[PDB]
């Protein structure tokens, strides 16, 4: 789906079911990486 | 709260339950602190979504009517202008909610006391985290308000590499990290109560925990240092 890797994020907001800002890498522009962020899924620059 | 005890029914009168409308039902989502009869302080990540919110004051047991509770709709949501939805490590994890109505203060419903702007707690100050959060990593939400003794880890220590290194900012407070006691999912946005010179004040807003677990040795619970936002707080309230 994506050529590269997602960054590891070692902090988690202390909330259950945080809001997702994407589901697929395709929900992300350019080097579109839908990844697991600090509080839900967000669009990262890969690795 | 992992490794706590159920709090006495009147121990933390400023503790609120922030809930969202979930079908026809309401779902407990975060903690908060009653700071004015019509204002509540929480985490930005808790109200930075398009949900219908309510606040419950004088709450003890989430599943039973204690008779001490008041339910109030949320009238205004004010998120810190520097808050970035994505980056909780960047800080500015704080929001103020204007209640639809002013609460009645009693034995069970009382205002939370904030610190003087800039107050910095020494290493190992006595604090208590409260909340209805998971009682174990990947466990279930507590039914009754829990509390756990969680002392401060000063910045110099917290930001050291065996702790949170560069993740923790001077605008945050770390407490715990003993691997036994800690905040956990559903505790976010609630208070960190500290005793300083014989007086309690609300010094933290629960923010985040480790990705490896809630209670992780040398991975303290991180909170937004309230004392750093007093002027922001002061202007919002004055004008909203």
Domains in chain A: how many in total?
A: 1
**Are B155 and B223 in the same domain?**
yes
CATH code at A30? 4.10.75.10
SS3 B111: coil
Domains in chain B: how many in total?
A: 2
**Are B90 and B120 in the same domain?**
no
CB B191 within 8 Å of CB B12: yes
CA distance linking residue A45 with residue A32, whole number of Å:
7
Substitution target from A11, A12, A14 for chain B, most B beta carbons within 10 A: A14
A37 lies within 8 A of chain B by CB: yes
B155: left (phi over 0), alpha (psi -120 to 50) or beta: alpha
Strand partners, B77: B97
Strand partners, B41: B33, B96
CA distance linking residue B216 with residue B214, whole number of Å:
6
Structure tokens belonging to residue B149: 């003794």
CA distance linking residue B191 with residue B220, whole number of Å:
15
**Are B70 and B132 in the same domain?**
no
Structure tokens belonging to residue B56: 């419950």
Look-up of token digits 């069970």: B108
Query: Half-sphere exposure (CA, 13 Å, Cβ side) for A46?
Result: 13
Number of neighbours of residue B2 by Cβ within 10 angstroms:
26
The verdict on whether B188 is a catalytic residue reads yes
Look-up of token digits 């005890």: B5
CA distance linking residue B155 with residue B172, whole number of Å:
8
**Are B120 and B105 in the same domain?**
no
SS3 A38: coil
Number of neighbours of residue B189 by Cβ within 10 angstroms:
33
**Are B125 and B8 in the same domain?**
yes
Expressed in Å, this structure's resolution amounts to 1.9
Which residues does B22 contact at the CB level (< 8 Å), separation at least 6?
A: none
Domain limits at B72? 13-111+228-240
Catalytic residue among B17, B159, B182, B188: B188
What are the Cα distances from residue B153, in Å, to B89, B113, B196, B220?
A: 17, 22, 15, 8
Cα Rg of chain B, angstroms: 16
Q: Is B43 in Cβ contact with A15 (below 8 Å)?
A: yes
Chain B residues inside the 8 Å CB shell of A8: 211
The verdict on whether B93 is a catalytic residue reads yes
In this structure, the dihedral spanned by the alpha carbons of residues B95, B100, B105 and B111, taken in order and rounded to 10 degrees, is 10
Q: Is A14 in Cβ contact with B188 (below 8 Å)?
A: yes
Nearest CA-CA distance, residue B150 and chain A, Å: 16
Q: Nearest-CA neighbor of B106 among B37, B175, B196, B23?
A: B37
Domain limits at A29? 1-47
């Amino acid at each position: 789906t994506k050529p590269g890797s997602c960054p590891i994020i070692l902090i988690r907001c202390a909330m259950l079911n945080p809001p997702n800002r994407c589901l697929k890498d395709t929900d992300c522009p350019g080097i579109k990486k839908c990844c697991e962020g600090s509080c839900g899924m967000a669009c990262f620059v890969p690795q | 709260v992992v490794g706590g005890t159920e709090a006495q029914r009147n121990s933390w009168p400023s503790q609120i339950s922030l809930q969202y409308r979930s079908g026809s039902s309401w779902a407990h989502t975060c903690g908060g602190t009653l700071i004015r009869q019509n204002w509540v302080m929480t985490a930005a990540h808790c109200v930075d979504r398009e949900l219908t919110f309510r606040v419950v004051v004088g709450e003890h047991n989430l599943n039973q009517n204690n008779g001490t509770e008041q339910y109030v709709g949320v009238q205004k949501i004010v998120v810190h202008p520097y808050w970035n939805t994505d980056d909780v490590a960047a800080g500015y994890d704080i929001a103020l909610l204007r209640l639809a109505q002013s609460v009645t203060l009693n034995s069970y419903v009382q205002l939370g006391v904030l610190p003087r702007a800039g107050t910095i707690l020494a290493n190992n100050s006595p604090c208590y985290i409260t909340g209805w959060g998971l009682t174990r990593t990947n466990g279930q939400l507590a039914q009754t308000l829990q509390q756990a003794y969680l002392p401060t880890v000063d910045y110099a220590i917290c930001s050291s590499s065996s702790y949170w290194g560069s993740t923790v900012k001077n605008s945050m407070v770390c407490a715990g990290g003993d691997g036994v006691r800690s905040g956990c999912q559903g505790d976010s946005g609630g208070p960190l109560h500290c005793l300083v010179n014989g007086q309690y004040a609300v010094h933290g807003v629960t923010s985040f925990v480790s990705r490896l677990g809630c209670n992780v040795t040398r991975k303290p619970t991180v909170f937004t240092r309230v004392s750093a936002y007093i002027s922001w707080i002061n202007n919002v309230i004055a004008s909203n």
